[model samples]
Target: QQLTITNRKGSGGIPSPDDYPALRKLTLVGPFTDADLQRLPPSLRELDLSLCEGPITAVGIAHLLALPLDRLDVSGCELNADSARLLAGHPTLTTLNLRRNAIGDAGVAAFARNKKLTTLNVSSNGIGPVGVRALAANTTITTLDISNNEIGDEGARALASNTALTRLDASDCGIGPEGTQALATSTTLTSLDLSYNAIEAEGVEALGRNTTLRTLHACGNELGHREAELLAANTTLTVLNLSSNAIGNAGARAFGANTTLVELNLSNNGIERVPEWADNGKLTTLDLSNNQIGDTAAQVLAASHTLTTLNVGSNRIGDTGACALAGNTTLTTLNVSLNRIGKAGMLALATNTTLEKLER
Candidate 1:
């Protein structure tokens, strides 16, 4: 019943992380052979044979294309435009992660097709927005990540008309809020990470009405409370990363009211008292790292059982916060790194046998 084959990187993707449905990802152990792939269970619906350091010729790709594959990851492969041009005709593929592959714009132009494919991650590749524009023809994809590329505002403008996209990550791609505003009108989106972009409150305001989105990572942007309040009302949102932004405790209540939120990272923003959610009971992953929360917030954090991973690293949480997690069984990973928690605080979590990994 081992239907999917993953001969790629160290840890394979899918079922392990519960991330993808195909249960397949690329793995690069050494040189791979056709026989190695052939030995896998023939009923595989998805194949992840990336970074195997083997020659993935057009003939080999055609052999794989003949299967019932719906997802594929050829990242770190030696394939060129010739390989992609040959394989882009796949009708069943819905998601592809060609990250770090040498496939250029020429390859993308040759590969673009009309199919059910909706998710594509070409991050760390040499392709720019021109390559991305070529992909615009396949409007079925809902998620795309083209981070760390040379694409500019023009590329961003091209994505403004994307109606089917639900998630997009264009970080470190030289796109500003002007570009951000263009993509904001598309309401079908769910997750967006414009981190490391030159965006400000104006850009944040443009996306204020995106109610369908559940997660947003605007770290390294000049955002403030105006944007935070807009996001707090989102009923579907479970994760919000306003870290490295200008948002303070002013919009804390907005976040507290969002009952669906399980993870909130407000690190690098000053003034910290558990954002009124500890008593409300919903957040499981809270990163208050690099802040100034003291013993006063510890009492509020003690009532939190929903937390599984709490990062109070580089903060002022002393003995009190450490004692709060003593009986918190749900918290399996706790990071109190570079804190003022002395021996007294250390004993509190040491007694917590439920925790599998504790970072101090």
Candidate 2:
């Protein structure tokens, strides 16, 4: 059994551990006191104390030492260097989320001593190259989220040697083209997010060689047609987000040829038309919102047999385009808001039985 209490005050004190003997996960959101921590179930396997208002000092966190916890989240807590060190001796701890804490390089250095951790999220913790280098030594970590920090090129380079990592999120971390290329060397990565960074066309070209990646989020980057063509060669990629980039008609044409991609987000990419190759019936979720798509593009995309969710909002689509989608039985969710669709087109979509969710 799991108990999740969130977004509420700690006015009602937590129930006694005796009341929930079979509880395996406990998430407490509150202004909880030290006494509340002492009364927690000792057999809990996962505990989340995120966004709790109080001093999560060493003494308060120490109360959880004897509990058989394998996962702990103290995000948004003002944990300092010494306070983070207290978690080092935990025998069964494997997953720890200390996001948005005051733990700097020294605190991360202390966390590196724990040999059993497989998943860790220390985002927004003021981590730099030195801190990332310290984390690279932990061979057990497979999933890591270190976004919103200042780990630059050197930091990203240090992590390339750690092949144990399979998933990584380093968004908004000041990584450049060199850092992006360094991370592309990891053969085990299946999912990676490098959004809000400055890894431009060169970075995308480097990442094209990474055949193991299935999901990639590179939004808010500087990528053009050449970069898009390079990434289109990666046949294993199923989910890709290239929104808010400089991807134009040529980039759209490049992505249209990709058959393995199931979910593609090309929103706000200055796309004027949908390429003919987008008819490849592999995509289930397609977002072309905030583009220059018209009735012609809409008619072409409406023929996609596998698409279950489609977003074409803020386009130049009209009644003809809106009416064309009425024939698509596989689409369950459709968004055509802020388009040039008329009342006749709206009435046309009213007959679509398979569409459970619709906008405009």
Best lDDT among the predictions, by candidate number? 2
TM-scores of the candidates are: 0.75, 0.90
TM-score of 2: 0.90
| Residue lDDT tens for model 2, 122-234 | 88889898988987777778998889889999888877767778899989999999999998877878889999998977888888877778899998887887888888777
Candidate 1 residues lying further than 4 Å off, grouped into runs, are 1-28, 32-41, 55-59, 110-112, 222-237, 246-262, 270-285, 303-309, 325-338, 350-360
Model 1 agreement with the true structure over 1-360: per-residue lDDT tens digits? 234433444333223323333433333344555444433333456666664566656666666666566767557476676767766767787777777776787766654564676787777677788977776555677888878876777667777666777888988777887888877666766788888887666677776656666788888776677777776765566788888776677666567666777888888877476566745567788887887778767556656757788887887877877788666777787888888788988888888899988898
Q: Which stretches of candidate 2 lie over 4 Å from their true place?
A: 1-13, 278-281, 356-360
